[PDB]
Design a protein around this ligand. Structure first.
Ligand SMILES: CCCCCCCCCCC(CCCCCCCCCC)(CO[C@H]1O[C@@H](CO)[C@H](O[C@@H]2O[C@@H](CO)[C@H](O)[C@@H](O)[C@@H]2O)[C@@H](O)[C@@H]1O)CO[C@H]1O[C@@H](CO)[C@H](O[C@@H]2O[C@@H](CO)[C@H](O)[C@@H](O)[C@@H]2O)[C@@H](O)[C@H]1O
Ligand SMILES: CCCCCCCCCCC(CCCCCCCCCC)(CO[C@H]1O[C@@H](CO)[C@H](O[C@@H]2O[C@@H](CO)[C@H](O)[C@@H](O)[C@@H]2O)[C@@H](O)[C@@H]1O)CO[C@H]1O[C@@H](CO)[C@H](O[C@@H]2O[C@@H](CO)[C@H](O)[C@@H](O)[C@@H]2O)[C@@H](O)[C@H]1O
Ligand SMILES: CCCCC/C=C/C/C=C/C/C=C\C/C=C\CCCC(=O)O[C@H](COC(=O)CCCCCCCCCCCCCCCCC)COP(=O)(O)O[C@@H]1[C@H](O)[C@H](O)[C@@H](O)[C@H](O)[C@H]1O
Ligand SMILES: CCCCC/C=C/C/C=C/C/C=C\C/C=C\CCCC(=O)O[C@H](COC(=O)CCCCCCCCCCCCCCCCC)COP(=O)(O)O[C@@H]1[C@H](O)[C@H](O)[C@@H](O)[C@H](O)[C@H]1O
Ligand SMILES: CCCCC/C=C/C/C=C\CCCCCCCC(=O)O[C@H](COC(=O)CCCCCCCCCCCCCCC)COP(=O)([O-])OCC[N+](C)(C)C
Ligand SMILES: CCCCCCCCCCCCCCCCCC(=O)OC[C@H](COP(=O)(O)OCCN)OC(=O)CCCCCCCCCCCCCCCCC
Ligand SMILES: CCCCCCCCCCCCCCCCCC(=O)OC[C@H](COP(=O)(O)OCCN)OC(=O)CCCCCCCCCCCCCCCCC
Ligand SMILES: CCCCCCCCCCCCCCCCCC(=O)OC[C@H](COP(=O)(O)OCCN)OC(=O)CCCCCCCCCCCCCCCCC
Ligand SMILES: CCCCCCCCCCCCCCCCCC(=O)OC[C@H](COP(=O)(O)OCCN)OC(=O)CCCCCCCCCCCCCCCCC
Ligand SMILES: CCCCCCCCCCCCCCCCCC(=O)OC[C@H](COP(=O)(O)OCCN)OC(=O)CCCCCCCCCCCCCCCCC
Ligand SMILES: CCCCCCCCCCCC(=O)OC[C@H](COP(=O)(O)OCC[N+](C)(C)C)OC(=O)CCCCCCCCCCC
Lengths: 75, 469, 64, 90, 26, 172, 481, 24
């Protein structure tokens, strides 16, 4: 108990696991000052248009796409 | 008064020598103070929520815009004091903080642009004010042309602002093509039911919001904030946010918007998570600004958001000014000046500050715990009002996400205090030097406001009930 | 009570002056005339707020 | 050319106080054992044994107690129950 | 080393001596 | 409850995921025929997440004949299983499964929407104290509720009885 | 008065240089004042008595007599009075226990300590949700600073834990409080049992409130922050945290949760019993394999709080009275054990590893007697308040659910195991070779420990002496049709 | 250590080289 649960699993769903998760996610979001940003703005515009088209079609279908997008950006 | 100031100042700055910059800026500081105190009584016009359309239905005047206007003057007063007064009288600080010749005129013109954005009743006025603010803020970014990073920053800013301005102009013109009108006042419940304006209005909102840097288009603004002179960053990170957000709140064109909901969620997550791995002070503060802009974006999804938004924007302005001023003061105790535009850069450079100046760290603690939202500091009540609004309107998942984002951002807020209350080996023994009285008094006033504002909460709500109902 | 509001606002002014002295690495009573000045100014602001609030209450009651 | 003000005089941070005689004879082996036990969470990994204890205590035991506690809610009433009477309500 | 519970801990040590435990009573 | 057409909705989701992965691959290329070579499998990420989420959601909703957050919990579990298979480690697979399932279950519990359901929200609902004998709606409050409602909702026992004790045990 | 007293404070500071005498005097005056209040407190009434309001719009800086109440409400009944008396008893001892071991920035340290004590004392006076929450969070900055500056080696991680875990719970508490505010448009505790929310809304609000209670009590499985924060806190932080801040949780249940969400509480009670049985059994077992003194003492508190919770949600008068008495007895005993491990042994040897300690009886017989007495008190010897609390709590829990309470009766055994296993090694054997002889417990340490021992003994032999304040409370919250 | 305890002294966030440094 004291090791595997308390200093194991409870710390995983606690300070240590959260620390690792935040380290990875933060590294990914930080990971040609112009050309790149311009590509970003086009990609945002087109992605938003297509996402809203999907939402008009069926909102349930867009949830996995949003999940995958967040997986790209953070992971 | 603002136009008269701009005109006179152009004349004087033309006819004055480079050594008179600080005296001129002190002159304008006092002038703005005088206007704020002598012309404040015009609030009385707005009793019972009386609205006035002015200039042939181009400008709109109500209690809300009057308050935003006063707040913008207060911010300009504080910001101009940093340039009009020397922290210390040594050579180093003459090199560190010297005001450019035209800086004050640019500041006043950008303020005028912001006020015209706030009051805009018609799209032509909105676009002209947006372009006025955008141009002045480009130039403010670029006025310190000895800095490589500042010039690179101004160019990136020019291009991103130009693209967003074209998106905005396109949205305005599509609205014209569908309705043959340039005013939102022409819109009604019947019209919104009859026609699908959602696409146009959301494009306009997004074009405005990407200019203050909401995700996923944040990084260019954080880079600009990082690469500008510190006393420039104190300004350019604040005024555009206030003007654009206030306009959007007043207009209410994205109520229950699914796209704004998703983007506000994303902005909260990116602002909270992305600021964790930061080591530079100003990038940490810019991600702070991103998270707080998310908190304010949430208020664009609902009606009757005036109280929560005003309270939040005021307390945020005060906290933001105060934290920048504290970082500025802590410069005197660093042992390494990185360069003449950004003297302190890394969070770890504050290490052991409590041993050099205990009360500076006290003020730092107070402002940080306001940002986290510890009662009874102002930050707590700001978040409380926001939660009240969004839960009253059924944004349950967004409320859960807001909780989580405040938790996450507390980590890199406390990073500052953590390194600040650690211990440094070489501890100040003595010094003859005195920090300037005026800026220390201003910093103290901001700190005392953050600490003891809550005693006036019930009085404030009583006033609000008669000027905004 | 107006007197209590003035005392409180003056207390805020005294707090601001004290914090300003300490932030300058100076003794608490470094320039005692500044305490009077800041107390007077913050009492003025408190008085302004009090008058505005009283007027607001008057207006709310008059619509009855 | 950018250097802090010459006006500043910096001395050592001394913490003061009376250096007491050192009344404990530290044992390096005990200290290392203590450090390993104290920061065991930094090195925990999911294996068959560790996963087994996790799934027992965090899942199986709570499920057992939950079944008991929701199955037996309101079941018993004992106060002054007499002969022949049911101590069970359902 | 000898007992199952000590063996369970072997992945969880990094750079700590894997000691064979002997009952101090024996 | 009338069924979701699991097969069709899953097919449309496959199409949407494939297109989205294509767009992400094109972007990825532009930001860095090699686009799919240097894709990092993002097309597969999108396609698998889409199929898993939609198929599991419709499957669970049809089987339970209910529409609520639990279906989203299952669907998030499946999506996390897909995303955590990429780690090729059992602990990480289990962690992705359970945590993505929990996050999506929370999402489905709050309404499975990012914006609000305006008509159900408090601002657009009957609130305050109810009138004479009206039925309680979600946001309304009273001073006394009907004892039959208590007995039905909470259930008999543990001090919950149809009649107050003192009244029931009164002698005549 | 305030102006003059401020002048007195300033002059004492300028001349003496160490505020700590002034703070001790002040806290003693506060204790005397609360006792005067108890004298003048009417016990034949279930109404809040010493009411006052702050930050009302008509008088922001004074007390309000207006016909509209938009400020923050304060007042006390018997339940608040009990914990207030406990608080004012504990504060001067908290100041005194660090009278000599703080030799740097000492004025700041004592200021933080006294401020935290005053914040908790005021928190017990709060009469509405918003002020309760305000004073409930106001400690976290002070605890963070105190632990970070005056803590042991691992104090940075301790400070971050104590801030983050409590914020995490408090924000869900804030969600529940915001829902109540916007649904009722009222926040007070005076008449909040008069509002009968729909069962579904009750079930939803209860979740946020109980998440806050889980983090703050703590309860399994989110208790892991407490052992850290305790072990690296300085002595005053540990004593305050163990003796008052945990009881804030129990007071939170009784004041905020039970009167408002009665039916939802009835629905959720078996889940509470699951969580409490978990915390008791599992934390008591985990205590067996700890090697740090302060960590073991910290783990004891969690189990005793689990028994307290089992008592307080039992829906019986005996259960609630037992929970209160157990809270008070724990506030007496746990600070004493923390005094021992973190102020006597730690200040003499500056180590907390258990292996170093052995056979302390030979050189320090008095300290050994104190350890024996306090440990038998902690495990629940009768004629100690701890036994009365655990016994009454277990009665209530057994009535509410016979199986769960019957199993919970194993806490007596488990507590005996860990505590006596510790004290066995500490007191006996041959004096340790690793440490040298030091002084026995001094007059100050003995004074503090005697205060705590006599308090727990007094309420242990005649627990009835608390009833005059609590006989309304034991009926104010039970929900029987 | 950083706000997550990570090591602290390329992406612009962690880039340390300073084109505005007086020695460059
Ligand atoms: C369920 C079914 C799981 C079945 C698999 C058991 C599992 C998961 C346990 C997770 C528990 C989840 C609990 C969370 C909460 C649940 C609600 C733990 O299997 C463990 O078993 C232990 C005991 O046997 C071992 O400990 C020590 O081991 C010995 C060293 O000396 C001693 O003999 C023993 O004495 C020690 O103790 C561990 O090393 C081992 O990982 C994984 O085991 C297996 O899966 C694979 C694929 O990932 C793992 O990677 C493989 O090997 C890698 C190079 O090695 C490479 O990458 C690659 O070649 C491959 O990929 C391995 O890990 C593998 O072994
Ligand atoms: C502390 C932990 C926080 C986590 C828990 C928060 C989650 C809240 C869930 C509870 C709740 C909001 C309550 C908010 C209260 C305060 C918020 C608390 C703080 C916010 C953080 C969300 O209820 C959602 O539950 C989801 C299922 O899980 C549904 O998912 C979706 O299901 C499918 C679509 O039909 C789709 O397939 C898909 O879109 C999803 O699958 C949603 O449709 C549904 O809105 C319930 O709200 C609603 O409840 C109903 C009847 O209850 C009320 O109307 C009632 O009408 C009669 C009967 O109808 C009654 O006779 C009448 O009396 C009453 O008028 C409403 O007025 C409204 O109020
Ligand atoms: C400088 C750059 C210059 C470049 C210029 C060239 C570009 C021109 C166009 C681009 C303009 C800028 C693009 C901006 C992004 C577009 C996204 C966008 O507007 O939000 C969407 C568009 O909702 C469509 O229904 C619209 C659906 C999208 C149209 C379909 C997609 C077509 C693609 C076909 C392949 C707005 O819905 P919304 O949020 O109100 O969503 C809901 C919902 O719509 C309503 O039912 C609810 O009642 C309402 O409350 C609300 O919550
Ligand atoms: C509702 C919210 C709205 C507003 C609330 C904000 C502020 C309160 C309102 C008004 C504030 C007005 C305050 C005026 C009184 C304050 C006051 O003692 O003088 C100054 C600061 O004076 C401002 O720097 C005056 C600058 C005014 C700007 C303050 C705005 C923030 C502080 O004295 P001080 O002893 O250090 O000044 C001494 C002395 O004057 C010199 O002769 C000495 O040689 C020198 O060593 C110096 O230390
Ligand atoms: C002698 C003239 C000097 C006046 C100069 C004013 C400068 C403004 C500069 C900065 C804004 C700083 C704080 C603004 C206060 C809000 C006033 C108000 O009551 O807000 C209401 C509207 O409430 C709201 O929406 C919410 C406002 C959010 C405030 C957040 C901070 C609260 C804590 C501040 C405590 C005040 C410090 C007093 C210390 C003794 C507008 O009131 P109103 O439009 O009727 O104008 C007031 C009459 N007046 C023109 C004569 C002054
Ligand atoms: C002839 C020229 C020279 C003399 C000048 C003549 C001017 C006449 C009027 C002088 C000012 C008197 C009115 C204001 C009182 C301020 C007195 C003062 O100096 O500070 C008070 C106190 C520090 O007082 P002091 O005993 O001197 O301590 C110095 C170092 N220990 O500091 C404090 O107590 C700070 C407390 C502030 C917060 C209190 C909030 C509660 C209300
Ligand atoms: C076609 C028919 C159907 C299509 C369905 C919709 C289309 C969706 C488009 C998918 C876009 C995926 C995002 C993307 O392009 O990501 C690529 C890029 C990452 O590139 P890189 O810099 O290498 O990042 C690696 C990190 N080390 O990332 C970027 O370029 C930045 C991301 C910009 C995308 C904007 C997305 C809008 C916001 C979504 C909200 C996210 C979740 C919030 C809930
Ligand atoms: C310190 C940090 C503290 C953090 C505390 C935990 C925060 C959240 C962690 C993740 C929990 C995720 C919860 C997912 C639950 C899955 C779900 O779908 O819930 C829906 C369920 C039923 O909802 P409904 O559709 O209304 O059905 C009514 C039938 N009576 O609704 C329910 O009945 C509730 C199911 C879960 C119960 C609570 C779980 C723990 C909280
Ligand atoms: C920073 C955290 C957030 C801060 C939020 C709140 C800050 C409040 C600041 C402390 C001020 C509260 C204490 C003083 C208020 C009470 C003064 C008083 O006069 O009591 C009123 C009450 C009724 O008196 P009355 O109606 O006038 O009739 C008298 C008949 N002879 O008379 C009575 O019944 C006596 C009441 C006794 C009250 C005991 C209070 C215990 C602690 C006192 C000092 C606490 C200071 C806290 C400092 C840390 C900040 C929390
Ligand atoms: C993070 C840190 C957060 C800190 C939070 C603490 C906030 C402190 C606010 C202080 C206001 C509350 C004061 C409690 C009221 C006690 C009192 O009554 O003081 C006397 C006087 C008004 O008294 P009166 O209204 O006449 O009622 C008594 C009738 N028997 O009261 C007065 O005259 C006012 C004197 C107090 C002035 C305080 C100014 C700020 C302190 C610097
Ligand atoms: C819906 C769920 C809401 C709550 C769960 C998500 C909130 C995220 C908290 C961020 C965090 O984990 O902060 C980490 C903190 C402690 O900080 P640290 O890990 O030691 O490192 C940072 C400190 N340093 C850098 C100085 C060492 O630990 C926690 O308090 C975790 C509480 C989660 C409860 C289970």
């Amino acid at each position: 108990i004291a090791h595997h649960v308390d200093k194991g699993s409870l710390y995983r769903l606690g300070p240590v696991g959260i620390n690792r998760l935040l380290n990875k996610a933060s590294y990914n979001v930080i990971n040609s000052s112009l050309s790149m940003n311009s590509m970003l703005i086009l990609i945002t515009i087109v992605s938003l248009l297509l996402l809203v088209l999907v939402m008009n079609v069926n909102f349930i279908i867009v949830i996995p796409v949003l999940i995958s997008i967040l997986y790209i950006l953070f992971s | 008064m603002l136009i008269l100031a701009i005109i006179s100042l152009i004349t004087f700055v033309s006819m004055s020598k480079l050594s008179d910059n600080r005296a001129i800026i002190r002159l304008i500081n006092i002038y703005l103070i005088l206007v704020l105190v002598l012309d404040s009584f015009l609030y009385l016009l707005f009793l019972n929520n009386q609205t006035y359309t002015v200039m042939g239905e181009l400008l709109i005047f109500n209690s809300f815009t009057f308050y935003i206007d006063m707040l913008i003057y207060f911010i300009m007063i504080v910001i101009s004091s940093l340039y009009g007064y020397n922290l210390y009288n040594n050579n180093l600080y003459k090199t560190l903080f010297e005001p450019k010749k035209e800086l004050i005129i640019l500041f006043l013109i950008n303020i005028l642009g912001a006020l015209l954005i706030v009051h805009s009743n018609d799209f032509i006025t909105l676009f002209v004010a947006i372009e006025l603010q955008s141009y002045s803020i480009y130039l403010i970014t670029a006025i310190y042309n000895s800095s490589y990073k500042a010039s690179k920053a101004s160019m990136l800013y020019f291009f991103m602002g130009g693209i967003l301005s074209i998106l905005i102009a396109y949205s305005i013109n599509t609205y014209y093509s569908v309705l043959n009108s340039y005013t939102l006042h022409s819109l009604d419940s019947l019209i919104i039911n009859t026609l699908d304006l959602n696409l146009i209005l959301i494009a306009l909102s997004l074009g405005l919001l990407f200019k203050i840097g909401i995700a996923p288009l944040h990084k260019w603004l954080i880079s600009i904030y990082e690469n500008t002179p510190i006393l420039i960053t104190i300004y350019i990170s604040l005024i555009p946010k206030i003007s654009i957000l206030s306009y959007l709140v007043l207009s209410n064109i994205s109520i229950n918007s699914l796209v704004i909901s998703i983007l506000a969620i994303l902005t909260l997550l990116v602002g909270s998570v992305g600021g964790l791995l930061q080591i530079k002070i100003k990038r940490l503060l810019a991600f702070s600004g991103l998270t707080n802009a998310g908190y304010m974006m949430l208020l664009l999804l609902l009606n009757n958001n005036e109280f929560s938004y005003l309270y939040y924007i005021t307390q945020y302005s005060i906290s933001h000014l105060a934290i920048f001023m504290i970082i500025i003061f802590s410069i005197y105790y660093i042992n390494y000046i990185n360069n003449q535009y950004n003297p302190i850069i890394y969070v770890n450079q504050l290490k052991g500050l409590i041993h050099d100046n205990a009360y500076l760290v006290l003020s730092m603690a107070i402002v940080v715990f306001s940002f986290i939202g510890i009662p009874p500091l102002l930050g707590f009540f700001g978040k409380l009002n926001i939660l009240m609004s969004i839960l009253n309107n059924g944004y349950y998942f967004i409320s859960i996400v807001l909780i989580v984002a405040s938790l996450i951002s507390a980590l890199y807020y406390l990073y500052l205090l953590n390194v600040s209350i650690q211990d440094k080996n070489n501890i100040l023994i003595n010094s003859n030097e005195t920090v300037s009285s005026v800026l220390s008094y201003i910093l103290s006033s901001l700190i005392i406001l953050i600490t003891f504002g809550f005693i006036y909460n019930s009085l404030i709500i009583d006033i609000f009930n008669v000027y905004f109902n | 009570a107006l007197f209590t509001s003035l005392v409180g606002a003056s207390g805020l002014g005294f707090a601001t002056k004290f914090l300003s002295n300490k932030i300058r690495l100076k003794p608490a009573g470094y320039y005692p005339l500044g305490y009077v000045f800041s107390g007077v100014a913050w009492a003025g602001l408190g008085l302004v707020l009090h008058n505005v609030h009283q007027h607001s209450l008057e207006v709310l009651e008059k619509k009855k | 050319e950018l250097k802090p003000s010459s006006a500043i005089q910096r001395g050592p941070l001394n913490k003061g106080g009376w250096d007491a005689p050192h009344a404990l004879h530290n044992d390096g082996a005990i200290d290392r054992y203590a450090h390993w036990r104290t920061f065991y969470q930094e090195r925990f990994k999911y294996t068959r044994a560790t996963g087994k204890s996790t799934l027992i205590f965090l899942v199986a035991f709570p499920a057992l107690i939950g079944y008991v506690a929701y199955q037996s809610e309101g079941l018993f009433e004992f106060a002054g129950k007499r002969r022949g009477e049911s101590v069970t309500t359902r | 080393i000898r007992a199952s519970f000590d063996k369970a801990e072997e992945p969880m040590l990094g750079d700590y001596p894997d000691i064979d435990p002997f009952p101090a009573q024996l | 409850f009338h069924p979701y057409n699991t097969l069709g909705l899953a097919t449309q989701s496959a199409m949407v995921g494939l297109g989205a992965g294509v767009v992400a691959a094109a972007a990825r290329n532009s930001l860095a025929l090699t686009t799919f070579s240097k894709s990092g499998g993002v097309v597969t990420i999108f396609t698998g997440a889409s199929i898993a989420y939609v198929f599991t959601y419709c499957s669970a909703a049809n089987l339970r004949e209910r529409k609520d957050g639990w279906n989203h919990m299952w669907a998030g579990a499946a999506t996390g299983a897909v995303l955590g298979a990429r780690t090729k480690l059992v602990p990480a697979f289990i962690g992705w499964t359970v945590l993505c399932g929990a996050a999506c279950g929370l999402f489905g519990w709050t309404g499975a929407r990012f914006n609000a359901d305006r008509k159900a929200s408090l601002e657009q609902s009957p609130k305050g104290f109810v009138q004479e004998d009206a039925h309680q709606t979600f946001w309304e409050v009273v001073h006394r509720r009907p004892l039959s409602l208590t007995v039905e909702q909470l259930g008999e026992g543990r001090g919950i009885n149809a009649v107050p004790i003192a009244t029931a045990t009164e002698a005549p | 008065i305030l102006l003059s007293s401020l002048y007195l404070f300033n002059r004492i500071l300028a001349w003496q240089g160490n505020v700590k005498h002034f703070y001790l005097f002040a806290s003693n005056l506060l204790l005397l004042f609360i006792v005067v209040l108890y004298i003048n407190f009417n016990t034949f009434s279930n109404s809040f008595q010493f009411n006052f309001e702050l930050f009302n719009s008509l008088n922001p800086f004074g007390l309000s007599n207006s016909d509209i109440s938009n400020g923050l409400l304060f007042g006390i009944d018997g339940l608040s009075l009990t914990f207030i008396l406990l608080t004012v008893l504990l504060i001067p001892l908290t100041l005194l226990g660090n009278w000599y071991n703080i030799n740097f920035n000492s004025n700041l340290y004592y200021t933080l300590v006294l401020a935290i004590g005053l914040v908790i004392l005021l928190n017990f006076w709060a009469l509405d949700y918003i002020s309760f929450y305000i004073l409930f969070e106001a400690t976290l900055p002070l605890l963070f600073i105190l632990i970070h500056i005056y803590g042991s080696s691992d104090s940075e991680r301790a400070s971050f834990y104590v801030l983050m875990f409590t914020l995490s719970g408090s924000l869900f508490m804030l969600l529940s409080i915001v829902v109540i505010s916007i649904v009722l448009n009222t926040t007070n505790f005076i008449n909040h049992n008069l509002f009968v929310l729909s069962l579904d809304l009750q079930t939803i609000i209860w979740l946020g409130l109980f998440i806050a209670i889980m983090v703050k009590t703590p309860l399994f499985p989110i208790h892991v922050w407490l052992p850290v924060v305790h072990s690296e806190s300085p002595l005053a932080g540990s004593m305050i945290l163990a003796g008052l801040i945990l009881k804030l949780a129990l007071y939170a249940i009784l004041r905020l949760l039970l009167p408002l969400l009665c039916e939802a509480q009835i629905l959720y009670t078996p889940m509470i019993y699951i969580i409490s049985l978990l915390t008791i059994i599992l934390t008591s077992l985990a205590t067996l394999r700890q090697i740090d003194l302060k960590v073991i003492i910290a783990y004891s508190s969690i189990s005793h709080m689990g028994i307290a919770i089992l008592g307080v949600c039992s829906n019986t008068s005996l259960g609630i009275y037992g929970s209160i008495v157990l809270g008070v007895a724990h506030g007496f005993v746990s600070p004493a054990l923390f005094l021992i491990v973190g102020g006597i042994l730690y200040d003499r040897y500056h180590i907390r590893i258990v292996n170093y300690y052995k056979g302390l009886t030979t050189y320090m017989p008095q300290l050994a007697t104190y350890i024996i007495i306090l440990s038998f008190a902690n495990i629940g010897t009768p004629l100690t308040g701890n036994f009365t609390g655990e016994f009454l709590s277990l009665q209530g829990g057994f009535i509410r659910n016979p199986i769960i309470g019957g199993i919970s009766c194993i806490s007596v055994l488990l507590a005996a195991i860990y505590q006596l296993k510790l004290t066995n090694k500490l007191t006996g054997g041959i004096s340790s070779i690793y440490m040298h002889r030091t002084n026995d417990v001094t007059i100050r340490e003995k004074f503090i420990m005697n205060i705590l021992i006599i308090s727990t003994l007094i309420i242990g032999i005649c627990p009835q002496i608390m009833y005059n304040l609590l006989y309304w409370t034991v009926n104010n919250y039970i929900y029987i049709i | 250590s950083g706000a997550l305890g990570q090591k602290v002294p390329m992406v612009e966030d962690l880039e340390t080289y300073d084109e505005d440094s007086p020695i460059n």
